[PDB]
């Protein structure tokens, strides 16, 4: 069974989503954010000494 | 199989705060007809469990 | 000598779909006299038990 949620980027932070199926017992997942990096990408032009 | 059924269930309130952490407790009441583990939630944006 | 005595009954419901299966579940209250065994049937043509 396939879902879809949206969390929110902020680190420590509780968030929590369903799965409903159908006849089965509900489902309740938790979901956290623990590192968050972010990376450019370079190209040298020139240097100094 | 191993899904309790529940029924009649009442909540009530005693104390709370605003204010920047777990500061809002509740009892729950209910009649049981068999041991196990169930799932708990509530449905607003305004009170995270 | 065997038959026990079953009175002030009282149905409830909890869940239901359609579905194809036993998908549909109740709950039975009872004050007993003594313990046996006894027999159910649901008198009506759309629901099976």
Redesign the interface.
């Given at each position: 069974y396939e879902h879809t949620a949206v969390i929110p980027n902020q680190v420590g932070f509780?968030y929590?989503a369903?799965v409903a199926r159908?006849?089965?017992?509900?489902?309740?997942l938790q979901m956290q954010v623990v590192e968050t990096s972010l990376e450019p990408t370079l190209n040298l032009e020139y240097i100094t000494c | 199989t191993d899904a309790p059924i529940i029924s009649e269930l009442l909540c009530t309130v005693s104390t709370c705060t605003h204010s920047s952490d777990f500061g809002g407790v509740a009892v729950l009441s209910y009649k049981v007809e068999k041991a196990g583990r169930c799932d708990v939630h509530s449905h607003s944006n305004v009170a995270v469990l």
């Open positions: 509780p929590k369903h159908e006849g089965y017992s509900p489902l309740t | -």
